[PDB]
C-alpha cells in the first residue's frame, strides 16, 4: 500500500518511533518519503553487489532480512524479506528500530544524509496531529 502523509505519521507515533534512539518522528518521515514514497511494496535490486532493498524503509538483504539469493548475507532482524512487503508495517518498524541500534544510527541510509540531514524536516509532520 501507499500511505498518505499524516496517516503514516499517526501510525509511526502509535508504534513508538518518536524519539527512538534519539530520532525524531519527522526524520523517520523524511527517510520513508525519499526511500519509497511511502510505498510498502517497493523493491530495488542492486546489480552491483547482488542484494535487494525491501519495503517502505528500503531495508537491505545483505545485513537485515533473509531472501536466500544474496551472497554472504546475514539476517539481523530475523525476518524473511517478504515480511517487509506487507501492508501492515509492524515488522518493518521493528526491523528499522534494530537497524538504528548499530553505531551509525539513522546515518545507515545514505538517502537520509543527502536529503534529510541538516534540513528543516518539520514539513513532513505539519498538520498531522502528532
Ligand atoms: Na540477509
Swiss-Prot record:
The keyword Secreted applies. SUPFAM superfamilies: Lysozyme-like (SSF53955). GO terms for cellular component: azurophil granule lumen; extracellular exosome; extracellular region; extracellular space; specific granule lumen; tertiary granule lumen. Disulfide bonds join 6-128, 30-116, 65-81, 77-95. The active site is at 35, 53. It is an enzyme of class 3 (hydrolase). Lysozymes have primarily a bacteriolytic function; those in tissues and body fluids are associated with the monocyte-macrophage system and enhance the activity of immunoagents. It is linked to Amyloidosis, hereditary systemic 5: A form of hereditary systemic amyloidosis, a disorder characterized by amyloid deposition in multiple tissues resulting in a wide clinical spectrum. AMYLD5 primarily affects the viscera, and the predominant clinical features are renal dysfunction of varying severity, and intra-abdominal bleeding. Inheritance is autosomal dominant. Lysozyme C is capable of both hydrolysis and transglycosylation; it also shows a slight esterase activity. It acts rapidly on both peptide-substituted and unsubstituted peptidoglycan, and slowly on chitin oligosaccharides. PANTHER family: LYSOZYME C. This is Lysozyme C. The lineage of its organism: Eukaryota, Metazoa, Chordata, Craniata, Vertebrata.
